[PDB]
Structures are given as C-alpha cells and as structure tokens.
Design a protein around this ligand. Structure first.
Ligand SMILES: OC[C@H]1O[C@@H](O)[C@H](O)[C@@H](O)[C@@H]1O
Ligand SMILES: OC[C@H]1O[C@@H](O)[C@H](O)[C@@H](O)[C@@H]1O
Ligand SMILES: OC[C@H]1O[C@@H](O)[C@H](O)[C@@H](O)[C@@H]1O
Ligand SMILES: OC[C@H]1O[C@@H](O)[C@H](O)[C@@H](O)[C@@H]1O
Ligand SMILES: OC[C@H]1O[C@@H](O)[C@H](O)[C@@H](O)[C@@H]1O
Ligand SMILES: *[C@H]1O[C@H](CO)[C@H](O)[C@H](O)[C@H]1O
Ligand SMILES: *[C@H]1O[C@H](CO)[C@H](O)[C@H](O)[C@H]1O
Ligand SMILES: *[C@H]1O[C@H](CO)[C@H](O)[C@H](O)[C@H]1O
Ligand SMILES: *[C@H]1O[C@H](CO)[C@H](O)[C@H](O)[C@H]1O
Ligand SMILES: *[C@H]1O[C@H](CO)[C@H](O)[C@H](O)[C@H]1O
Ligand SMILES: *[C@H]1O[C@H](CO)[C@H](O)[C@H](O)[C@H]1O
Ligand SMILES: [Cl-]
Ligand SMILES: [Cl-]
Ligand SMILES: [Cl-]
Ligand SMILES: [Cl-]
Ligand SMILES: [Cl-]
Ligand SMILES: [Cl-]
Ligand SMILES: [Cl-]
Ligand SMILES: [Cl-]
Ligand SMILES: [Cl-]
Ligand SMILES: [Cl-]
Ligand SMILES: [Cl-]
Ligand SMILES: [Cl-]
Ligand SMILES: [Cl-]
Ligand SMILES: [Cl-]
Ligand SMILES: [Cl-]
Ligand SMILES: [Cl-]
Ligand SMILES: [Cl-]
Ligand SMILES: [Cl-]
Ligand SMILES: [Cl-]
Ligand SMILES: [Cl-]
Lengths: 65, 65, 65, 65, 65, 65, 65, 65, 65
C-alpha cells in the first residue's frame, strides 16, 4: 500500500470511447485540481473534467448499472 | 479497536450527483477532521464536509428516503 | 476508489500469528498516529505499534522474503 | 499508461528501514507539496520530507550505489 | 522515475503494422497536442493521429481482447 | 518525428544535490515550457527551470569537466 | 589531445546582439577560466562569462530554437 | 603567430564609408576599452565605439550579409 | 577574428615528420602550460614539448631557412 495520491493537472480534450471504460473515480480533495479519472479495460487512466457534459454522462452511465 | 478506521483530510468542492449515492456514514470522532463519506452505487467513496448545506440536504434525503 | 485513509488509534496487545500475515503497510503521514498495519489472510487490517520488536521483525521478514 | 501524478500531502515521521528501500523518486513539480517517495522491495511507498537529514542521507546512499 | 511527460508534435504517416503494436496510451492533457502513442514490440513509442480510423480501430482492438 | 519527446510543465523548487547528477539535457523547443532535465546516477529525472541561477551553475559545472 | 584547444582569459562587458549568433560552445574544463564562446553568422568569436544572466539567456534561446 | 592583442584607446568620430568595409571584429576582453575594429578592403583598420548607432548598424549589416 | 587563445595541455609523443610542418608558434603566455605548436600542411595544429631536442631543431630549421 502507498501513501501517495493520484492527482490531475490537465484534462483530455476529446471523449474516449465509452465502451473501453471499466470504471471511474474522483481524485482526492487534497488535489489542487478537481478531476475525474476514467480507467479502461486494459487499465489506461485518463484525467477528465467533471464540469464537462460527456464526463458527467459517462459517470452517470457507470453508476446506473 | 486495533482495526483501521477511515479518516478524511479534505473534501472535493463539487457535490457528487445525489442519485448516485446509495448510503453514507460519519468518520470516527477520533479522526482529526469531522467528515461524512458518501458511498455510490458502484462503491466510489467521497469525503464530504458535514458543515456544508448540500451535504446536510443529502443526508436528510438519504434518511427520509 | 476512495479518498478516505486508513488510520489507527490503538495498537493490538497480543502479537499476531506470523503465518496469518499476508502483507503490511505504514499508515499515511496524514494520520495523527504513526502505525503499522498488517493484513491477514482473511483481509482484516490490524494496527500495530511501530516500535515493538515483533512488529519490526515481521516487517523485515515480509520485505526480505 | 496514466496521466495522473503521485503527490504527497504529509510525511512519515519515523525513518523506515534503509535496507527495505529498493528505490526513491522526487514527486513532480506540479505537486503542491515537495516530497520524496521511498519504494520498498515489496513496493510499499512512503512519502518523505526532503528537508529531513535522514531522508537526504538515504537518497545520497541510493544514488551513490 | 521521471516528471517529464511524453508529448507528440507529429503523427506517423503510414499506419503501423498491427502485429507490432503491443500497447497504447493517450498523451497527457498537459501536452498542447492531443495524440495516441503506440508502443511497439521493439519498445519504441510512436505518435499517431487520434482521429484516424486505423488508430481508433487499433485502440479498440487493444482494449477488447 | 513520430517519436514522443519529453516535456516539462513544472519544476521542483528545492535543488537536487549536484553530486548525484550524471548528465542533463534541454527539452525540445516544441514544448510549451523551456526546461532542463537533470539525470541522476540511478537515472531519476528532474525538470528544472533554465532561468534559475543554480540550474545554470549546475550546467556549467557539468560542462566544464 | 596534442591538438590546441581554445581558452578564454577575459570577457567583453557589452553583450553582442542575439540575432548575430548562430552557435555557441564551452571551452575545455582544462582551461584556467570557465567560458562560453559565441560564434556569429560571419564567424566572429566572443568569449562570454557563463555566470552572467544574459549569457545563459542566450544559451537557453539557442537551445530552444 | 603572435600573442600581442590589438586594443583601441580612442574612436573615430566620423563614420567611414560602409562600402569600404569588408569585415569587423570585437577587440579582446583583455583590452581596457571596449571597441569595434572595422577592416577595409585595402586593410585600413579603424577603431569604433560599439555604443554608437552607426557602428551597431554597420555590424548588423555585416553579420546579416 | 576570435577572442579565444590556442592553449596546449598535452605534448605529442611521436615527433612529427619535418616535411609535414608548414610553420610554428609559441602559445600565449596566458596559457598555463608552455608549448610549441607546429602547423601541418593539412593545417592542423600540434602541441609539442618545447624542451625536446627535435622540437627545438625544427624551430631552428624554420627560423633559419
Ligand atoms: O488515495 C486516496 C487517499 O490515499 C492516502 O494514502 C492519502 O494519504 C490520502 O490523502 C488520499 O485521499
Ligand atoms: O506522465 C507522468 C506525469 O508527470 C507529471 O510531472 C506531469 O504533471 C503529468 O502531466 C505527467 O502525466
Ligand atoms: O567554430 C567551431 C568550434 O566548435 C567547437 O566545438 C570547437 O571547440 C572549436 O575549436 C571550434 O572553433
Ligand atoms: O547537451 C546540450 C548540448 O548542446 C550543444 O549545442 C552544446 O554545444 C553542448 O555544449 C551541449 O552539451
Ligand atoms: O591572452 C593572450 C592573447 O593572445 C591573442 O592571440 C588573443 O587574440 C587574445 O585574445 C589573447 O588575450
Ligand atoms: C493500501 O493498503 C490497503 C490495502 O493493502 C488499503 O487498500 C489502503 O486503503 C491502501 O492505502
Ligand atoms: C482508485 O484507488 C486508488 C486511489 O484512490 C488507485 O488510484 C486505483 O488505481 C483506483 O482504482
Ligand atoms: C506511461 O506510458 C509510457 C509507458 O508505456 C511512458 O513511460 C509514460 O511515461 C507513462 O505515461
Ligand atoms: C516513478 O514513476 C511514476 C511517477 O513518475 C510512478 O509513480 C512510479 O511508480 C515511480 O517509480
Ligand atoms: C596565430 O597562430 C595560429 C595561426 O598560425 C592561430 O591562428 C592563432 O590563433 C594565432 O595566435
Ligand atoms: C582579427 O583577428 C586578429 C586578432 O584577433 C587580427 O587582429 C586580425 O587582423 C583580425 O582580422
Ligand atoms: Cl476539458
Ligand atoms: Cl463497462
Ligand atoms: Cl438513492
Ligand atoms: Cl454551504
Ligand atoms: Cl487522524
Ligand atoms: Cl516483543
Ligand atoms: Cl517530517
Ligand atoms: Cl538497496
Ligand atoms: Cl496537488
Ligand atoms: Cl540527498
Ligand atoms: Cl507541449
Ligand atoms: Cl495526420
Ligand atoms: Cl480517417
Ligand atoms: Cl558528476
Ligand atoms: Cl539564430
Ligand atoms: Cl527560451
Ligand atoms: Cl565616438
Ligand atoms: Cl561588404
Ligand atoms: Cl590555460
Ligand atoms: Cl628528440
């Protein structure tokens, strides 16, 4: 186990393919920049802006299943 | 006693969507900071500030179902 | 994923059986108390005193295996 | 790969066993808090304060082979 | 470990042979240009245009397997 | 050209010790931020601000021997 | 080794025009005085003090071309 | 070859004909007075003040071909 | 014209073939090491030990021709 925290300082511009996304998570509140991280099936991890529509829709899609 | 207990040391500013939350709990009073943790349908866990209005509203909504 | 942190507030009195320990970790520096956590074969987390000899020996055993 | 960055927001107080440490690294400059992360043989990861003598000594020990 | 980031400034013209791709990832959101990087079996990183059909199909192939 | 190139988007404030640096290089002029990367004996890589006095002193020392 | 190497034993105070410089190099570390030599388009060669701010500004500019 | 250095201790006031100049050079930093030497086709050599505009313009003209 | 000075830090071991030598000169008194430089027909500069008999004979040959 690790004491480090994953933070984001920038976001991807174009929406990654929804079908590739395995899960998501909100970055810690200690992070200076609020962000969402999408995790793909092969464990690519992409920082996303929670203020974006497609990001919110993706999260909504993941939770409601 | 000797079991770990979850503590929060910060809160994200942006409120997570009410419809995603399935339950909540208070962190132990032994923690340095008072906190509420919202658990989502997919078991994402977010620390929240109990002194915030929207947090209170969420808890009320969760309790009054 | 969760942004809560496993913190300890008490140390186990009786040394755990070594053959039950599958792994260990140090609690975050965010926690007010320094602590070692052992994870058992049954995935239970047990806080232990970092200064105790058996604790240091278990850790050294786990790392040097 | 991932575009999240490991950040530290607190430091361990007690020096961890030098012999357990496999490597170290400096956290990114994006991180609000400057830190050093020690990585053990079994990949425990511990945040450390680079302004501490034992931390600097450990780093010196690691890089000088 | 390094705090530099792999960024792209040009996209390969000829589609890479699929059988040589062993991994992909998206460049950080910090990079000025959006890009897809394919990692070859010879461990070389190749920038590709995210909009190109063969690029999206390669990614989709890599994630769904 | 289709190869990725290292870019820096921040610098740690605390100068790493001169003695563990074995080499340096400038990031591509295509990067949004001008930067120097110091490579340690154990191949840690740290982004540095070329406009800083200590960075230039280090480079001079590395190149004058 | 038996070949001569250029050394500098002083520096002109007034910085030469940046636009005139096409390249630069460090004198050998064997030279008693550390120095940078700027080479103009018409191949004039001027000794410069590497500890000067404008000199490192020039070098940085020449590198992030 | 010679280890004497050409130095200037005064400057011409009247600008010499640009078309007569085939080259220029900065006097060494060893010289007490910073200066520019213009060399004519028939190898007349004139000391000039680099702080004067016409001198700078002449140099700029020579370097930029 | 250049502000740098040709200095030597090593003496050639095998005496140059006399017929290859075009001219000679003494390195500046500014150089930390005394030396003789022979200029070859191919316009290369070779540092030589000023104490060696063959060096002094070559110089004597060149001056008394
Ligand atoms: O990864 C989430 C949590 O991990 C802990 O190790 C860190 O100390 C916390 O600050 C963080 O919120
Ligand atoms: O790739 C690793 C990370 O290094 C950090 O320094 C950067 O802020 C990130 O943008 C980058 O993704
Ligand atoms: O002008 C080209 C210059 O390149 C440098 O690397 C050499 O040390 C100089 O001797 C040479 O004059
Ligand atoms: O590593 C950067 C290199 O850039 C070249 O242009 C310089 O002449 C070298 O002195 C330098 O080492
Ligand atoms: O230092 C001795 C002198 O020798 C001459 O050849 C150089 O042009 C001067 O710059 C130098 O100062
Ligand atoms: C790492 O340690 C345990 C798992 O061993 C737990 O998930 C903690 O939350 C994490 O920091
Ligand atoms: C969420 O949990 C930890 C951090 O909380 C880590 O990044 C995991 O990869 C992710 O699933
Ligand atoms: C992860 O992706 C590649 C490796 O595949 C690279 O090392 C980057 O540094 C990281 O983002
Ligand atoms: C250093 O590289 C990345 C971050 O730069 C990651 O945390 C690795 O685990 C570490 O060794
Ligand atoms: C004179 O000697 C050689 C030419 O033979 C060289 O140019 C030196 O720089 C100069 O002092
Ligand atoms: C510049 O080179 C030497 C001195 O550096 C000499 O004066 C020449 O005449 C000039 O062209
Ligand atoms: Cl965005
Ligand atoms: Cl899914
Ligand atoms: Cl609900
Ligand atoms: Cl409020
Ligand atoms: Cl606590
Ligand atoms: Cl004991
Ligand atoms: Cl500390
Ligand atoms: Cl080691
Ligand atoms: Cl941060
Ligand atoms: Cl150190
Ligand atoms: Cl960039
Ligand atoms: Cl393209
Ligand atoms: Cl296409
Ligand atoms: Cl070194
Ligand atoms: Cl230029
Ligand atoms: Cl620059
Ligand atoms: Cl004048
Ligand atoms: Cl001309
Ligand atoms: Cl010298
Ligand atoms: Cl001899």
């Amino acid at each position: 186990s690790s004491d480090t925290t994953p933070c984001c300082f920038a976001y991807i511009a174009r929406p990654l393919p929804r079908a590739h996304i395995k899960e998501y998570f909100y970055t810690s509140g200690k992070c200076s920049n609020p962000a969402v991280v999408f995790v793909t099936r092969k464990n690519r991890q992409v920082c996303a802006n929670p203020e974006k529509k497609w990001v919110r829709e993706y999260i909504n899609s993941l939770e409601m299943s």
